[PDB]
Amino acid sequence: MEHVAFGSEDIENTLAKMDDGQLDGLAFGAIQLDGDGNILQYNAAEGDITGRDPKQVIGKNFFKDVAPCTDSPEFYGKFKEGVASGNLNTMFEYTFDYQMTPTKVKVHMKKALSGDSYWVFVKRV
Numbered sequence: 001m002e003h004v005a006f007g008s009e010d011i012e013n014t015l016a017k018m019d020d021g022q023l024d025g026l027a028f029g030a031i032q033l034d035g036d037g038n039i040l041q042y043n044a045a046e047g048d049i050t051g052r053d054p055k056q057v058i059g060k061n062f063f064k065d066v067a068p069c070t071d072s073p074e075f076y077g078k079f080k081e082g083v084a085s086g087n088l089n090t091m092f093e094y095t096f097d098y099q100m101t102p103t104k105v106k107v108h109m110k111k112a113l114s115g116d117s118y119w120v121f122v123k124r125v
């Protein structure tokens, strides 16, 4: 396992060194989005959480296609406020209920080290 803790204050530095193969080693789910909500990386442990297979969701829009539960002021609203501000660091609980058994999760959204990319981290609660 790659040793990184969910909610780590420097998680965006640690993950900056990580390819898709190492993202899959994470103890929690991890999705990289660009400013428009497009999935750039999506890890296996999120796959286990949501049941989505990863190679298939890369390049789809998270807010519009993949995850519609998140299209609301409480998820997507925050994400968009953050994109436009150029800074994002928020944690909250949420339920995923699209085409799946309702699963409660802790979400952490953080701006990445690189310019126009954002992390979504996810873990069971």
Ligand SMILES: *C(=O)/C=C\c1ccc(O)cc1
Pocket: 031, 046, 050, 052, 066, 067, 068, 069, 070, 095, 096, 097, 098
């Ligand atoms: C709720 O948002 C529904 C589904 C879903 C699918 C994949 C991921 O990563 C999160 C949520």
